[PDB]
DNA sequence: AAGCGACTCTGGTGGGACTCGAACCCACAACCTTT
């Protein structure tokens, strides 16, 4: 099932951090590194016959300034920080000196502005379809970073820099006679209002409903400041509120947010993990959204106080075949063991069950991920080690099985600094570094994202085929396997060209007749991009058969939006008689449908033209192409595939994968069409920025 | 500023440091040591199986006698006689300077001092472990679980009135099953009780509690009974080298509670306390570059699990990959015990917040170190270091700030060979550091809050304790039968003159100009220093190497009217506590 | 006078970068080279 996929992606910078690689929902992967964050984009390229992963490399630049945390004036900060370190008692003057959180930059200290942590919103969150990340310095700079155009990533907002005014105008108490505002200049203040700013780690909610979503920040003191951001985010103006908990667990270490849904109820909490062993469950209480609600009480999930770390907390639901119920697993990496948890509520009310799976690693754990589909976690230690480890249902909650991944049979010595699956578990990423050669030490360090399958070509052509999604985008990770097939053996494989033949004989929805486009497209590209040229030459026909099809039924879309919405001049935003002769114009189209919406349509346009105009000649346009449009003396505007409006704008949002554009939506258009305009492209899910 | 000299001849600035860390230390003990710790773990006479004659044979060093020496001291006249004596025997101190050797019968490679609650007045003993052969060298890269031997060596109470006429003791050893021993810690505090404490017969009273760091990767953890208290409970009849085999406290190792895929982590090669009370956590660094850390009280079944034999084996609660390369040596903070700074063979020095693992405090790279030593008072580290990658020269002995004040590294004392071993006495705040070349020195830290750049010469706050010097008279047998072991020992009375006195001459010609030695075996060279712990014996100081030979001295010029006053008062304190 | 703490001041070497010196490689014209 384990083979590697031939890129290796080399690293300029130290890999850094806590769980320091992800892979978002959105097929980008993040490695928190001490001079970037390096970002990896799995593009599905079907423009090109290389059999290798497309990755896209982009990256998050560190912070050229350290973030000092605001305590108190400017000069009664200086005033304290000198008096600490005047301070003739060993214990005061290196307890300050030694914590580098009282100094972020110093004359021969090191800077620490590389990312300790970094964690991706989900899809939707961005100003564009896209997601965001959320980037956490050493030096507690905590951003939210977008990727606006491709090429720079951007800051939206520094939310270490808010709290701390949040923080400084209310004295840094949070409730607000909770007790007298302490003296600066003792040492436990200084060290407490450092202490409850000081952000852990950080995990976004799920997006709820104008859209939100949560970010969490979890402090050293066991606060947590649940931030809510509208939706799309852009900024400072985004965030809607700040509002703080307080655990109270002590030495706070890792943070997630459980989601539930049973009889069709909603419920949330907080998960909060101990540095010394404890995992509970907390209410947040404090929200103003009405379609999630809260936790009825905080419940322990381990109590024992073990001190072994969480290094690592995940959630994933499950239906439960037995219990015959919706579920939720949580599983902690504590130490080099693996903390699971299954919590179903039953008329019983919520049933917990709780144990570790043991005998993983003689290590402790590095990274730990799940499959978010089957529950599947895979675990990592320096040894090089990993192992999967899948959960088996039993008549109540599950056991556990596991076996050893054999990564040393496929890159030999190596040592392993973090895993991450792809969102479909195709995929394991995993950082690697050269390992022991045979007990001697490796003479120098160098860095990789490397990559290994883990189901086969024939497993993800079930599972593309028996799609939930039904979502190329999403599932782009199962289809690069598809992809890498057909390109190693130049043909769609039998089983899966009669299946999805079925598929559209039977169920015929546009995700199956994208799925079709994507196998023609890679194909096309596999003999090499005489009856090779008629092959090529009948392909290329074919293509352009279900390339029509999708941009048909797409026309069919528009017109029933503008069909079933007013009737008003703001259609001028939408080439309509255009589109209607052009749908109708040949019998090469059956659809009676179209044609008597184009007749309903029809009978209610106006004879007035308003025809469209190329801008450099006020000349018209006359409706010809799908593609592009030209007029009489000489130009050429590309068409856009959501509405119909060429492209005349000296700025147009091009697709992922460069298959298709749209315009910008304009304060003109109506909310109708600035819905249309943020849907994917007709020819692939794909952001189209 | 102080200005005028100090009645020992330094100068009152080189001194006023001195003094000042007598009073840091004892009010630092006064916060974070305490009097009893780990009161379920005493010594058990049944798990203490005397070996006999036959049965012991394996695990004795194997050189019966030692090298030839004969030891000059400096101001008296030339004895002239070649001592020699036997494995497990001492000279008597010196009348007048209560200097003492003795052999162990092989080379040295750990040791530690016995730690004594202050004032209590006891008898003092250290713990030792010298290889079986002196031609053995083991390579790191292999674990080695051969048959070895820890040795106590009981030093008596070291007061004035005591040490002329001293003589050490070997009160009792160990047979280890374990591979040779790579460091040895004791509790820092807390375990120690009174010999006449009433325990019943089977409970013997403790002496003390000790981790051994093994070559088989393992940390063994020993509390070991008081010698009157095993020798009253073993028959009178048993052969006086008493080597027992003793079933361990617990067995510290890496793992997890069902993983049988063994470690990487091989060789165990450096050992950490942690050093306030209640003494909770054990460090250890290993080959693989990890540093291990074990909650010795745990009763949680993921770390503690009990042998058939009774004992517990604890695997750790964290680990972490501090280096690249071998961790050779770890010295964690006193001052406040999140931090601990740790060196490698990839000779980075790397400064550690220990709830924050993931990135160090600061990596100051470095030539190789050997040893660390991080003294209460001061916020920066001192690193012995192996002279390879030095320029000619500028190899030594270095201090070097942890960061904040943003000092230059100072250079405290230049050294022609590797300095294999160094410890800062906190009631002294001064270091001895131990030479390939046999030389052993002290050195004197500025007060290190005031930047090192402004002093003016170095030279003036250090001196020779000894030398050793091969005189003709590579194997073992090849040298010992061709050459005998020359220790030329400084008159430490006083520092009077000092620079101008014949040992500081031999000692800057030294300095520079002296080569290395190669083609011999270096039976000069020694391997441990360590500076007591005790305020009882604060100025006293042990050292050994690869003669075997053993060496103990008082430097009677940094013992001075406040420690002595100190000692009375903690005397007085003790005795009206316990009775 | 006698001394402290800056501030240069005189020399020695290492880190990474880079010149160094060599053989190796092209393709052609010269002609030795062969039945
Ligand atoms: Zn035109
Ligand atoms: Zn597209």
Same mark, same amino acid.
């Given at each position: 099932m384990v083979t590697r996929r031939e890129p290796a992606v080399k690293l300029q910078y130290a890999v850094s951090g806590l769980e320091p690689l992800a892979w978002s929902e959105d097929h980008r992967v993040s490695v928190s590194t001490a001079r970037s964050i390096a970002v990896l984009e799995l593009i599905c390229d079907v423009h090109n016959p290389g059999q290798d992963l497309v990755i896209h490399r982009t990256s998050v630049p560190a912070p050229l300034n350290s973030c000092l945390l605001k305590v108190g004036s400017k000069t009664e900060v200086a005033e304290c920080k000198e008096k600490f370190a005047a301070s003739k008692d060993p214990t005061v003057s290196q307890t300050f000196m030694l914590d580098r959180v009282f100094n972020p930059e110093g004359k021969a200290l090191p800077p620490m502005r590389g990312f300790k942590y970094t964690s991706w919103s989900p899809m939707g969150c961005d100003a564009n379809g896209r997601c965001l990340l959320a980037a956490l310095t050493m030096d507690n700079r905590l951003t939210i970073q977008a990727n606006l155009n491709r090429l720079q990533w951007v800051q939206l907002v520094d939310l270490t820099e808010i709290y701390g005014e949040r923080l400084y105008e209310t004295s840094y108490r949070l409730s607000k006679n909770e007790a007298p505002e302490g003296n600066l200049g003792d040492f436990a203040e200084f060290q407490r209002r450092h202490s409850m700013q000081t952000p852990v780690r950080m995990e976004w909610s799920g997006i709820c409903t104008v859209g939100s979503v949560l970010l969490a920040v979890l402090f050293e003191n066991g606060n947590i400041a649940v931030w809510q951001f509208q939706l799309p985010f852009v900024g400072k103006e985004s965030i809607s509120s700040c509002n703080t908990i307080e655990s109270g667990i002590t030495s706070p270490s890792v943070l997630f947010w459980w989601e539930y849904e049973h009889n069709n109820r909603k419920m949330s909490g907080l998960i909060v993990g101990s540095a010394f062993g404890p995992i509970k469950i907390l209410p947040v209480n404090l929200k103003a959204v009405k379609g999630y609600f809260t936790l009825r009480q905080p419940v322990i999930l381990? +109590?024992?106080?073990?001190?072994?770390?969480?290094h690592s907390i995940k959630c994933v639901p499950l239906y439960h075949p037995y219990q015959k119920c919706s579920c939720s697993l949580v599983v902690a990496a504590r130490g080099s063991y693996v903390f699971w948890c299954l919590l179903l509520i039953s008329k019983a009310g919520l049933n917990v069950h709780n144990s570790h799976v043991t005998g993983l690693h003689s290590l402790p754990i590095v990274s730990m991920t799940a499959d978010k589909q089957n529950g599947t976690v895979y675990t990592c230690s320096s040894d090089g080690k990993v192992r999967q480890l899948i959960p088996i249902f039993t008549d109540v909650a599950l056991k556990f099985e596991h076996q050893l991944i054999k990564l040393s049979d496929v890159f030999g010595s190596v040592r392993t600094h973090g895993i991450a699956v792809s969102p479909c578990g195709a995929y394991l990423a995993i950082i690697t570094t050269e390992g022991m050669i045979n007990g001697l030490h490796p003479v120098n360090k160098n860095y990789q994202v490397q990559f290994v399958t883990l189901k086969t070509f024939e497993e993800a052509a079930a599972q593309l085929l028996e799609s939930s999604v039904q979502n190329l985008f999403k599932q782009v990770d199962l289809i690069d396997l598809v992809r890498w097939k057909i390109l190693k053996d130049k043909h769609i494989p039998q089983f899966l060209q009669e299946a999805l033949e079925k598929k559209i004989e039977s169920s015929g929805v546009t995700y199956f007749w994208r799925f079709k486009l994507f196998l023609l497209r890679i194909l096309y590209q596999s003999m090499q991009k005489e009856p090779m040229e008629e092959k090529l030459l009948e392909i290329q026909g074919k293509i352009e058969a279900v390339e029509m099809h999708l941009t048909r039924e797409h026309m069919k879309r528009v017109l029933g939006e503008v069909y079933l919405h007013t009737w008003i001049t703001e259609n001028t935003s939408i080439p309509t008689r255009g589109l209607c002769n052009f749908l109708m114009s040949d019998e090469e189209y059956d659809d009676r449908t179209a044609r008597v919406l184009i007749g309903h349509i029809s009978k209610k346009?106006?004879?007035? @033209?308003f025809p469209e105009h190329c801008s450099l000649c006020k000349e018209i346009l006359?409706? @010809?192409?799908? +593609?592009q449009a030209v007029c009489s003396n000489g130009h050429i505007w590309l068409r856009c595939f959501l509405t119909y409006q060429s492209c005349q704008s000296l700025i147009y949002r091009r697709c992922l994968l460069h298959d298709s554009i749209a315009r910008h939506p304009a304060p003109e258009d109506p909310d109708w069409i600035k819905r249309l305009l943020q849907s994917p492209c007709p020819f692939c899910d794909s952001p189209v920025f | 500023h102080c200005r005028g000299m100090a009645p020992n001849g330094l100068p009152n600035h080189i001194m006023a440091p001195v003094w000042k860390c007598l009073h840091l230390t004892k009010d630092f003990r006064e916060q974070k040591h305490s009097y009893w710790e780990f009161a379920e773990w005493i010594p058990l006479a049944w798990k203490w199986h005397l070996l006999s004659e036959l049965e012991a044979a394996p695990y004795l060093p194997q050189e019966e006698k030692s090298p030839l020496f004969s030891v000059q001291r400096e101001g008296l006249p030339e004895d002239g006689t070649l001592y020699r004596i036997n494995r497990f025997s001492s000279i008597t101190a &010196?009348?007048?300077?209560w200097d003492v050797s003795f052999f162990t019968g092989g080379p040295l490679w750990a040791l530690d001092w016995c730690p004594v609650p202050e004032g209590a007045g006891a008898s003092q003993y250290v713990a030792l472990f010298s290889s079986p052969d002196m031609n053995e060298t083991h390579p790191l890269s292999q674990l080695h679980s051969g048959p070895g031997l820890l040795q106590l060596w009981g030093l008596g109470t070291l007061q004035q009135e005591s040490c002329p006429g001293n003589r050490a003791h070997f009160v009792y050893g160990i047979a280890c099953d374990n591979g040779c021993i790579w460091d040895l810690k004791f509790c820092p505090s807390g375990a120690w009780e009174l010999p006449g404490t009433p325990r019943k017969a089977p409970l013997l009273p403790r002496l003390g509690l000790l981790a051994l760091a093994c070559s088989d990767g393992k940390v063994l953890l020993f509390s070991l009974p008081h010698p009157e208290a095993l020798l009253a409970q073993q028959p009178p009849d048993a052969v006086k080298p008493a080597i027992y085999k003793v079933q361990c406290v617990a067995t510290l190792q890496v793992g997890s509670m069902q993983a049988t895929d063994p470690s990487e982590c091989g060789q165990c090669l450096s050992l950490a306390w942690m050093?306030?009370?209640? &003494?909770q956590h054990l460090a250890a660094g290993y080959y693989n570059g990890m540093v291990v850390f074990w909650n010795l009280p745990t009763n949680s079944p993921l770390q503690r699990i009990r042998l058939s034999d009774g004992s517990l084996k604890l695997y750790p609660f964290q680990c972490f990959l501090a280096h690249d390369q071998a961790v050779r040596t770890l010295q964690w903070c006193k001052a406040n015990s999140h931090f601990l700074v740790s060196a490698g063979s990839d000779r980075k020095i790397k400064f550690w917040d220990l709830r924050r693992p993931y990135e160090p405090i600061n990596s100051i790279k470095r030539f190789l170190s050997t040893e660390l030593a991080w003294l209460l008072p001061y916020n920066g580290v001192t690193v012995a270091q192996d002279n390879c990658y030095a320029s000619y020269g500028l190899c030594g002995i270095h201090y070097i700030d942890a960061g904040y004040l943003g000092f230059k590294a100072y250079f405290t004392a230049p050294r022609k060979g590797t300095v294999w071993s160094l410890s800062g006495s906190d009631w002294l705040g001064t270091i001895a550091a131990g030479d390939i070349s046999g030389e052993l020195i002290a050195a004197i830290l500025p007060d290190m809050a005031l930047n090192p750049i402004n002093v003016k010469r170095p030279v003036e706050r250090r001196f020779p304790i000894y030398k050793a010097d091969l005189i003709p008279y590579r194997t073992y047998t090849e040298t010992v039968n061709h050459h005998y072991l020359l220790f030329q020992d400084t008159d430490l009375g006083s520092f009077h003159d000092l620079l101008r006195r014949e040992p500081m001459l031999r000692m800057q010609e030294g300095e520079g100009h002296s080569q290395l030695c190669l083609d011999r075996l270096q039976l000069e060279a020694i391997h441990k220093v360590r500076f007591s712990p005790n305020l009882d014996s604060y100025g006293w100081l042990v050292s050994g190497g690869q003669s075997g030979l053993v060496r103990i001295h008082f430097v009677r010029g940094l013992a001075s009217p406040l420690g002595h006053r100190m000692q009375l008062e903690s005397r007085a304190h003790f005795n009206a506590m316990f009775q």
């Amino acid at each position: 099932m384990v083979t590697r996929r031939e890129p290796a992606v080399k690293l300029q910078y130290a890999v850094s951090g806590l769980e320091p690689l992800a892979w978002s929902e959105d097929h980008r992967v993040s490695v928190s590194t001490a001079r970037s964050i390096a970002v990896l984009e799995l593009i599905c390229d079907v423009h090109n016959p290389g059999q290798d992963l497309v990755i896209h490399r982009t990256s998050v630049p560190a912070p050229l300034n350290s973030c000092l945390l605001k305590v108190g004036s400017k000069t009664e900060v200086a005033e304290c920080k000198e008096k600490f370190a005047a301070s003739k008692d060993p214990t005061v003057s290196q307890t300050f000196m030694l914590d580098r959180v009282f100094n972020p930059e110093g004359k021969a200290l090191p800077p620490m502005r590389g990312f300790k942590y970094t964690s991706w919103s989900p899809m939707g969150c961005d100003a564009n379809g896209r997601c965001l990340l959320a980037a956490l310095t050493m030096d507690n700079r905590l951003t939210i970073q977008a990727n606006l155009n491709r090429l720079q990533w951007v800051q939206l907002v520094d939310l270490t820099e808010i709290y701390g005014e949040r923080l400084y105008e209310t004295s840094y108490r949070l409730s607000k006679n909770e007790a007298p505002e302490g003296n600066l200049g003792d040492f436990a203040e200084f060290q407490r209002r450092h202490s409850m700013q000081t952000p852990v780690r950080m995990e976004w909610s799920g997006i709820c409903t104008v859209g939100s979503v949560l970010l969490a920040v979890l402090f050293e003191n066991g606060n947590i400041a649940v931030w809510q951001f509208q939706l799309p985010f852009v900024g400072k103006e985004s965030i809607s509120s700040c509002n703080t908990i307080e655990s109270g667990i002590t030495s706070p270490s890792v943070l997630f947010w459980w989601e539930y849904e049973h009889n069709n109820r909603k419920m949330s909490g907080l998960i909060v993990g101990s540095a010394f062993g404890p995992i509970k469950i907390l209410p947040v209480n404090l929200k103003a959204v009405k379609g999630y609600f809260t936790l009825r009480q905080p419940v322990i999930l381990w +109590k024992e106080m073990d001190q072994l770390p969480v290094h690592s907390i995940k959630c994933v639901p499950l239906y439960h075949p037995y219990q015959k119920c919706s579920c939720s697993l949580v599983v902690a990496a504590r130490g080099s063991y693996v903390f699971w948890c299954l919590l179903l509520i039953s008329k019983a009310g919520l049933n917990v069950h709780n144990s570790h799976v043991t005998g993983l690693h003689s290590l402790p754990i590095v990274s730990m991920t799940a499959d978010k589909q089957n529950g599947t976690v895979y675990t990592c230690s320096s040894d090089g080690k990993v192992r999967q480890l899948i959960p088996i249902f039993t008549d109540v909650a599950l056991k556990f099985e596991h076996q050893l991944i054999k990564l040393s049979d496929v890159f030999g010595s190596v040592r392993t600094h973090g895993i991450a699956v792809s969102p479909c578990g195709a995929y394991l990423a995993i950082i690697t570094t050269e390992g022991m050669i045979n007990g001697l030490h490796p003479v120098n360090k160098n860095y990789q994202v490397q990559f290994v399958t883990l189901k086969t070509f024939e497993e993800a052509a079930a599972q593309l085929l028996e799609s939930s999604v039904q979502n190329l985008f999403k599932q782009v990770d199962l289809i690069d396997l598809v992809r890498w097939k057909i390109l190693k053996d130049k043909h769609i494989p039998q089983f899966l060209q009669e299946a999805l033949e079925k598929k559209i004989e039977s169920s015929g929805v546009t995700y199956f007749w994208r799925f079709k486009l994507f196998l023609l497209r890679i194909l096309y590209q596999s003999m090499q991009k005489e009856p090779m040229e008629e092959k090529l030459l009948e392909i290329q026909g074919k293509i352009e058969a279900v390339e029509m099809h999708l941009t048909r039924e797409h026309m069919k879309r528009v017109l029933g939006e503008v069909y079933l919405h007013t009737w008003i001049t703001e259609n001028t935003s939408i080439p309509t008689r255009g589109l209607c002769n052009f749908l109708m114009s040949d019998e090469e189209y059956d659809d009676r449908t179209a044609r008597v919406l184009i007749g309903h349509i029809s009978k209610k346009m106006n004879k007035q @033209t308003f025809p469209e105009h190329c801008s450099l000649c006020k000349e018209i346009l006359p409706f @010809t192409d799908r +593609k592009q449009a030209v007029c009489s003396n000489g130009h050429i505007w590309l068409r856009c595939f959501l509405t119909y409006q060429s492209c005349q704008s000296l700025i147009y949002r091009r697709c992922l994968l460069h298959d298709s554009i749209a315009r910008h939506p304009a304060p003109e258009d109506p909310d109708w069409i600035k819905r249309l305009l943020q849907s994917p492209c007709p020819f692939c899910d794909s952001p189209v920025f | 500023h102080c200005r005028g000299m100090a009645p020992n001849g330094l100068p009152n600035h080189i001194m006023a440091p001195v003094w000042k860390c007598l009073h840091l230390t004892k009010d630092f003990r006064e916060q974070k040591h305490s009097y009893w710790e780990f009161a379920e773990w005493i010594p058990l006479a049944w798990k203490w199986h005397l070996l006999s004659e036959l049965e012991a044979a394996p695990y004795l060093p194997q050189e019966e006698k030692s090298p030839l020496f004969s030891v000059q001291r400096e101001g008296l006249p030339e004895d002239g006689t070649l001592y020699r004596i036997n494995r497990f025997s001492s000279i008597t101190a &010196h009348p007048e300077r209560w200097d003492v050797s003795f052999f162990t019968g092989g080379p040295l490679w750990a040791l530690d001092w016995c730690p004594v609650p202050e004032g209590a007045g006891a008898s003092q003993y250290v713990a030792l472990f010298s290889s079986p052969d002196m031609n053995e060298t083991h390579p790191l890269s292999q674990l080695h679980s051969g048959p070895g031997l820890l040795q106590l060596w009981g030093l008596g109470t070291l007061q004035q009135e005591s040490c002329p006429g001293n003589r050490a003791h070997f009160v009792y050893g160990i047979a280890c099953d374990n591979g040779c021993i790579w460091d040895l810690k004791f509790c820092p505090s807390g375990a120690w009780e009174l010999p006449g404490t009433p325990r019943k017969a089977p409970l013997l009273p403790r002496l003390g509690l000790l981790a051994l760091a093994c070559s088989d990767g393992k940390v063994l953890l020993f509390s070991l009974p008081h010698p009157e208290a095993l020798l009253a409970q073993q028959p009178p009849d048993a052969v006086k080298p008493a080597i027992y085999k003793v079933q361990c406290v617990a067995t510290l190792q890496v793992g997890s509670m069902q993983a049988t895929d063994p470690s990487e982590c091989g060789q165990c090669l450096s050992l950490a306390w942690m050093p306030t009370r209640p &003494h909770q956590h054990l460090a250890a660094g290993y080959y693989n570059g990890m540093v291990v850390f074990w909650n010795l009280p745990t009763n949680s079944p993921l770390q503690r699990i009990r042998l058939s034999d009774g004992s517990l084996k604890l695997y750790p609660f964290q680990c972490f990959l501090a280096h690249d390369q071998a961790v050779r040596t770890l010295q964690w903070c006193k001052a406040n015990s999140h931090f601990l700074v740790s060196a490698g063979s990839d000779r980075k020095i790397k400064f550690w917040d220990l709830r924050r693992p993931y990135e160090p405090i600061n990596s100051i790279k470095r030539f190789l170190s050997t040893e660390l030593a991080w003294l209460l008072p001061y916020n920066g580290v001192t690193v012995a270091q192996d002279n390879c990658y030095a320029s000619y020269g500028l190899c030594g002995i270095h201090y070097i700030d942890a960061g904040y004040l943003g000092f230059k590294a100072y250079f405290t004392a230049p050294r022609k060979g590797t300095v294999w071993s160094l410890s800062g006495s906190d009631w002294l705040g001064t270091i001895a550091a131990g030479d390939i070349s046999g030389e052993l020195i002290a050195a004197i830290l500025p007060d290190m809050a005031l930047n090192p750049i402004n002093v003016k010469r170095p030279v003036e706050r250090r001196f020779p304790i000894y030398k050793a010097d091969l005189i003709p008279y590579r194997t073992y047998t090849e040298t010992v039968n061709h050459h005998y072991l020359l220790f030329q020992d400084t008159d430490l009375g006083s520092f009077h003159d000092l620079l101008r006195r014949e040992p500081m001459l031999r000692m800057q010609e030294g300095e520079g100009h002296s080569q290395l030695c190669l083609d011999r075996l270096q039976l000069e060279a020694i391997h441990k220093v360590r500076f007591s712990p005790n305020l009882d014996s604060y100025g006293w100081l042990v050292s050994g190497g690869q003669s075997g030979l053993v060496r103990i001295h008082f430097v009677r010029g940094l013992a001075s009217p406040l420690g002595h006053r100190m000692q009375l008062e903690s005397r007085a304190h003790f005795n009206a506590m316990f009775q």
